[PDB]
Amino acid sequence: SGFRKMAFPSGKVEGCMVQVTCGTTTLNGLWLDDVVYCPRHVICTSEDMLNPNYEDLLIRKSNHNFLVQAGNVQLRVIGHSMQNCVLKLKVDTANPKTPKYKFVRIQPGQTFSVLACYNGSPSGVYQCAMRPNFTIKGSFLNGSCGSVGFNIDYDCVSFCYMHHMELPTGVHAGTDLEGNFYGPFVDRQTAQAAGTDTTITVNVLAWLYAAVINGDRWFLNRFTTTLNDFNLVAMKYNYEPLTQDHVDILGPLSAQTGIAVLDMCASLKELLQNGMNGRTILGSALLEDEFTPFDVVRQCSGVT
Amino acid sequence: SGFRKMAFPSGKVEGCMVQVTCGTTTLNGLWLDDVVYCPRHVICTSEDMLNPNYEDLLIRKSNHNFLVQAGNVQLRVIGHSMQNCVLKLKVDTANPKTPKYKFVRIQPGQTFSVLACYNGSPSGVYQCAMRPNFTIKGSFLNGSCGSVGFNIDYDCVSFCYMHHMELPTGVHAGTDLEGNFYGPFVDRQTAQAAGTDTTITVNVLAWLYAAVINGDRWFLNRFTTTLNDFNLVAMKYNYEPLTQDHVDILGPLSAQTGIAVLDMCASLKELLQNGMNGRTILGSALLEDEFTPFDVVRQCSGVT
Ligand SMILES: O=C(Cc1cccnc1)Nc1cccc(O[C@H]2CC(=O)N2)c1
Ligand SMILES: O=C(Cc1cccnc1)Nc1cccc(O[C@H]2CC(=O)N2)c1
């Protein structure tokens, strides 16, 4: 027993982290096969970031202007191209450490691990969720651009995020591995603001199931509700509307615990309306929304 | 910016994880050089655990009775010995993936990463602290015994914990890599209880410094206090007494922020006496004690 914000083992991803330097700028790159993926703002100077024309800026860049280093060895860049907001640097050596990988665009609500990196070197790993407003609440400093978000299935790494920027509000914006930003964010140093951050209801429910499994049963009440009535209370508290798909995904958790999804919803409705009264759930004084129903089953069943 | 419970990259430790089977029992082992370290309760049956005589039980065990598997390859055990509560299985092949390592016994209050494992395979990584009562609040299921706690410095892994058991209260007990339990715990299926779990004051202070660095400044007040007055309030709330050593270790955080340690103590005294009033600090509705002052500087400076 015990419930922690667990991240996937990062070894398969550490093997891919490289340092990419363009002029004065150094950031991280992802080396899979003979391609190094990195944010395209590596070709920018601090003046360029205000209003950059990336096609024009890339025209003044040649293969030799991009310095790629993997540990202490320099990789020869034989080609370069721009795919949306990522640069793909073709290198002459394929990464011998390349794991089985997929490039995937995750949905908001879904979770993933981040391997924060500086100068192509990993500093730490933590679990994140793609917020409904398409930002992530990460831990990133200047120099962490190019750090990737990933999931692991058996031996296959699904890369879903590449860090590009921080908004003045302290939240982080980034792209999938095809260079497409999650949300309305543009890789320009212009005032951008994240919209309303809503709470991932299905994840809070999954974590309530995880608390019941672990012994925290105080919040369980003698009540039930309907999907429409629960959603009236979810609306007021900026919670994502619960759908029958969500109820379905909670099915294995509901089946294991023996608590109906709508019963857990009534318990959640009371937690929203009445607060926690100074008590805690899984050592947390607030309702946690960064565990998907898949994360809960995986952690409560030891899926390696 | 952003502050997360970050764990060290686990790649160097994944390379050491092996599966150790003795009779019907399977658990994890740590393969460093030609030695595999694992909990000695691997030689026990469910009946033996009630009151085991490990010397007598080991006398009926031979080199061939311990099955060690690293991935899909069986390792030949050429020697076996008991060091306190760990078995050291000498194998004929040295681990080619052995990183630079030290075996260290950490103090309560200190933090470390755990690579939870099942059948010699890593399932996830998370950050932990050694509680003042010598237990850890981990996430472990049956089959995770042998999972290790570690820290990383540059390229050197300092192994500090090996998971052995779970107490009926849901907390976890284990040993250093010399087989010595942290705390009064014995590897026997007998009713054991953890003592009072106090709050690591210096870590809560370090995390208040991390909140100030990150923009959360609401809790800052126009007051100060003395070490003895603060400790009167720490005592009432089961907080560890603050010493001049703690004030010293907080020195670089105090120097960076410009807030005196005793000033932060007055802010903490008010948080203890008045609560958080529904507000949050670093997205947490309670006072976090699992970040050391070293963890704070490392995360707020990008130490790879
Ligand atoms: O933020 C970083 C580096 C960094 C520092 C700290 C943490 N993570 C990333 N770069 C950057 C890149 C592209 C646009 C950009 O403009 C900002 C203004 C806005 O809203 N977005 C900034
Ligand atoms: O707990 C486990 C396996 C396990 C299961 C879930 C999570 N982590 C570990 N084994 C074990 C080993 C040695 C003594 C022992 O007795 C318990 C009674 C007590 O207080 N300690 C139990």
UniProtKB/Swiss-Prot annotation, chains A, B:
Coiled coil: none annotated. Residues 1-304 form the Peptidase C30 domain. Signal peptide: none annotated. Changing residue 142 to A: Does not affect ability to cleave and inactivate human TRMT1. It catalyses: TSAVLQ-|-SGFRK-NH2 and SGVTFQ-|-GKFKK the two peptides corresponding to the two self-cleavage sites of the SARS 3C-like proteinase are the two most reactive peptide substrates. The enzyme exhibits a strong preference for substrates containing Gln at P1 position and Leu at P2 position. Changing residue 145 to A: Complete loss of 3C-like proteinase nsp5 cleavage. There is a cross-link at residues 5, 90 (Glycyl lysine isopeptide (Lys-Gly) (interchain with G-Cter in ubiquitin)). Residues 1-304 are cytoplasmic. Changing residue 90 to R: In strain: Beta/B.1.351. The active site is at residues 41, 145. Inhibited by pyridone-containing alpha-ketoamides compounds 13a and 13b. In turn, alpha-ketoamide 13b (tert-butyl (1-((S)-1-(((S)-4-(benzylamino)-3,4-dioxo-1-((S)-2-oxopyrrolidin-3-yl)butan-2-yl)amino)-3-cyclopropyl-1-oxopropan-2-yl)-2-oxo-1,2-dihydropyridin-3-yl)carbamate) inhibits SARS-CoV-2 replication in human lung cells. Inhibited ex vivo by michael acceptor inhibitor N3. Inhibited ex vivo by compound 11a and 11b. It comes from the Viruses. It is found in: Host cytoplasm; Host Golgi apparatus; Host nucleus. Cleaves the C-terminus of replicase polyprotein at 11 sites. Recognizes substrates containing the core sequence [ILMVF]-Q-|-[SGACN]. Cleaves and inactivates human TRMT1, preventing tRNA guanine(26)-dimethylation of tRNAs. May cleave human NLRP1 in lung epithelial cells, thereby activating the NLRP1 inflammasome pathway. May cleave human GSDMD, triggering alternative GSDME-mediated epithelial cell death upon activation of the NLRP1 inflammasome, which may enhance the release interleukins 1B, 6, 16 and 18. Also able to bind an ADP-ribose-1''-phosphate (ADRP). 3CL-PRO exists as monomer and homodimer. Only the homodimer shows catalytic activity. Interacts with host FBXO22; this interaction promotes the proteasomal degradation of nsp5. This is 3C-like proteinase nsp5. It comes from Severe acute respiratory syndrome coronavirus 2 (2019-nCoV). The chain holds residues 3264 to 3567 of 7096 of the full protein.
